[PDB]
Design a protein around this ligand. Structure first.
Ligand SMILES: [Bi+3]
Ligand code: NI
Lengths: 106, 106, 106
């Protein structure tokens, strides 16, 4: 998927997590989020299609997705132990960071 | 070291995880796998020896090894909680991903 | 510049961990360390300023930061399970790695 489709997947799974009664299915959503972020590291925002793939802007892009991945890890480790809460709370900081990166590179 | 030797290490430690008896052996093998994957991130696979180190193909290669690293971390988080059988079930997905990378980049 | 500031932040939080008592202090210092390491991964160290962004030196630099991040994660996992002294030993290993990277790329 391209960049905006991956960001849409992230937002949709954040919504699934925030309204999750399915219990451990949060992990599934989190899983998808991870698979999105990693995939988005291979994409390029349209405004950076002219830059070099290793230019400082693209490096910042991929490293921001690394930050997202570490936050997703913080949520998923709590979800795996059996703590749906706190993971659902860190989903909000995840949404904040996702919106920040979206506004940054769109 | 060599990308092929790193793949050998990944396969050997997957075999170790498949026959592991406790959580310590699973954790040790997963740590060795993580080291091998981090080292292979700096390598160039045989299929991509005609591509620049910052080409999109090499970036996608490194992102694939990032995916492998996060799956390794999932297995390691399962092993830290004492869930050895869940860790081996995750090592199955690890083996699928490793075989896919081997077939893709050899 | 900012990479140097991130290295100094890493060193300060390593000192904080070495002089810590409970797990919350170690966790907070390790979270600050993760933030600083991620922020420095997308920077250019002074030794590599004369190199192209597409050079393999920068790729190895970022991969070394990935290694440092995973060591930070191991320390944070030790701290999250109420293991303070083990987290401090892991943080001494982190100090070794951080000083290695700092004196290598400064
Ligand atoms: Bi954990
Ligand atoms: Ni973890």
């Amino acid at each position: 998927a391209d960049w905006e489709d991956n960001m849409e997947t992230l937002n949709d799974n954040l919504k699934v997590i925030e309204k999750a009664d399915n219990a451990a299915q949060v992990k599934d959503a989190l899983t998808k989020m991870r698979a999105a972020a990693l995939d988005a590291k291979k994409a390029t925002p349209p405004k950076l299609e002219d830059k070099s793939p290793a230019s400082p802007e693209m490096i910042d892009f991929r490293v921001g997705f690394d930050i997202l991945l570490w936050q997703i890890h913080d949520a998923l480790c709590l979800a795996n132990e059996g703590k749906v809460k706190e993971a659902q709370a860190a989903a909000e900081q995840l949404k904040t960071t996702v919106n920040a990166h979206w506004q940054k590179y769109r």
